[PDB]
C-alpha cells in the first residue's frame, strides 16, 4: 500500500497510474531535471534557455536545436528502458572542458516494481500528487546553489546509465565507467514516487582545494 493518494475526485477521473504511464512521468522528469541542472550550474549560457511552466513552477529549458534533439533521444530511450525496468541509475557527470577533471556528479537511483506489469488495475495516485513530490525535488535542487562549489572553469557534461548486464544497447551508447569524483562530499536529496517507480536524487562535488 502507500501514503499520498491525492484528491479522490481527481483520482476518480484519472483512474490511476499504469506501468507505461509511470515510465513517461519518470522520463519526462529527467528531461526537466537535466535541463535544470545544466541551467543552474551554468553548464551552458543562460541566454541559451527559455522559460516554461511545469510541475507548478517556472523552469528553463534549452533552446539549442542540437541539444534539444539530443535530450529527446535520451528521454525516448529512457522511456523504453523504464517500461522494462532496465535502468537502475542515471548520472549527469560534470567536468572541466579542458582537463577532463570531474567536478560535480548528479546521481539518480531508480527503483522499479517488477510486478507492476501484472496489475489488475491502475494504482491509486493522482497526477497532481506526483507533481507535487517532483516540484519539491526541483526546488531543493535550486536551493543547492548556496553551498555547492562555484564552477569557475568551463565545463561540459555527460550522461551515464547503469543497467543489467543483458541489455542490448543502441550504437549511440558506449561502454563506460562510473566516473566518480576522485575526492568528494555529497548531499542526499529528496525523492518522488509514482508508486511504480521511485527516484532518489543526490549530488556530489569535489572538495574545495587551496
Amino acid at each position: 500500500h502507500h501514503h499520498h493518494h491525492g484528491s479522490a475526485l481527481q483520482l476518480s477521473r484519472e483512474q490511476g497510474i499504469t506501468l507505461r504511464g509511470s515510465a513517461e512521468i519518470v522520463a519526462e522528469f529527467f528531461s526537466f531535471g537535466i535541463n535544470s541542472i545544466l541551467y543552474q550550474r551554468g553548464i551552458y549560457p543562460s541566454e541559451t534557455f527559455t522559460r516554461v511552466q511545469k510541475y507548478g513552477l517556472t523552469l528553463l529549458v534549452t533552446t539549442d536545436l542540437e541539444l534539444i534533439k539530443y535530450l529527446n533521444n535520451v528521454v525516448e530511450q529512457l522511456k523504453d528502458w523504464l517500461y522494462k525496468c532496465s535502468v537502475q541509475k542515471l548520472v549527469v557527470v560534470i567536468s572541466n572542458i579542458e582537463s577532463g577533471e570531474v567536478l560535480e556528479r548528479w546521481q539518480f537511483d531508480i527503483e522499479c516494481d517488477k510486478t507492476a506489469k501484472d496489475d489488475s488495475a491502475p494504482r491509486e495516485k493522482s497526477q497532481k500528487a506526483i507533481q507535487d513530490e517532483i516540484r519539491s525535488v526541483i526546488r531543493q535542487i535550486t536551493a543547492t546553489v548556496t553551498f555547492l562549489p562555484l564552477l569557475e572553469v568551463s565545463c561540459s557534461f555527460d550522461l551515464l546509465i547503469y543497467t543489467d548486464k543483458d541489455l542490448v544497447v543502441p550504437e549511440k551508447w558506449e561502454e563506460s565507467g562510473p566516473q566518480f569524483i576522485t575526492n568528494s562530499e555529497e548531499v542526499r536529496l529528496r525523492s518522488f514516487t509514482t508508486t511504480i517507480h521511485k527516484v532518489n536524487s543526490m549530488v556530489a562535488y569535489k572538495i574545495p582545494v587551496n
Binding site: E66, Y70, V169, W173, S176
Partner: peptide
C-alpha cells in the same frame, strides 16, 4: 554495467 551517451561537442 555502465553506458555513456555524450551530448553534441559544443
Amino acid at each position: 554495467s555502465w553506458y555513456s551517451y555524450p551530448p553534441p561537442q559544443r
